[PDB]
Ligand binder design. Sequence first.
Ligand SMILES: Nc1nc2c([nH]c(=O)n2[C@H]2C[C@H](O)[C@@H](COP(=O)(O)O)O2)c(=O)[nH]1
Ligand SMILES: [Mn+2]
Ligand SMILES: [Mn+2]
Ligand SMILES: [Mn+2]
Length: 156
Amino acid sequence: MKASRLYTLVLVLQPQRVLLGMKKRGFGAGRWNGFGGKVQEGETIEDGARRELQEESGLTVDALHKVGQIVFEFVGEPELMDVHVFCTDSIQGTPVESDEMRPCWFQLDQIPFKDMWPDDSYWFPLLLQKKKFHGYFKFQGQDTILDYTLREVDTV
Ligand SMILES: Nc1nc2c([nH]c(=O)n2[C@H]2C[C@H](O)[C@@H](COP(=O)(O)O)O2)c(=O)[nH]1
Ligand SMILES: [Mn+2]
Ligand SMILES: [Mn+2]
Ligand SMILES: [Mn+2]
């Protein structure tokens, strides 16, 4: 039995493109990713996801929808990362670079998998098919998956 810490991840997914951010520092630096971070005390998970989206990309959205949950375990770390993944297609402003992230749009036939976390190759296709998922990935370091589970679910 391990304890887990709550994190969010937000994908701005439009009909032909997705917004990703190049992580400029910290965890997963150097990889394109959705926007997110630790959930803070008192806020709902969804509101924490909205907050991190605004902080990291400048975008303000009224609502998100839950699309998945991924649990990450790292060799040598007792604490699991419980990542709650959200989408929206509805935005109303322009992305702006923050200290954490440089946003960039990618066409949906140019998803930059080689420059994303390795696990994204497994679950991101489900997100694109509008399927809900639960995943678990155990990493050695940043690059090597030792064990994983991925399942489509009807509710997140
Ligand atoms: N796409 C993707 N995102 C991840 C993985 N692991 C991981 O912590 N994240 C996200 C969750 C959070 O949005 C962010 C980590 O929190 P910070 O932004 O506070 O460093 O990275 C992963 O393997 N793939
Ligand atoms: Mn953040
Ligand atoms: Mn972050
Ligand atoms: Mn934060």
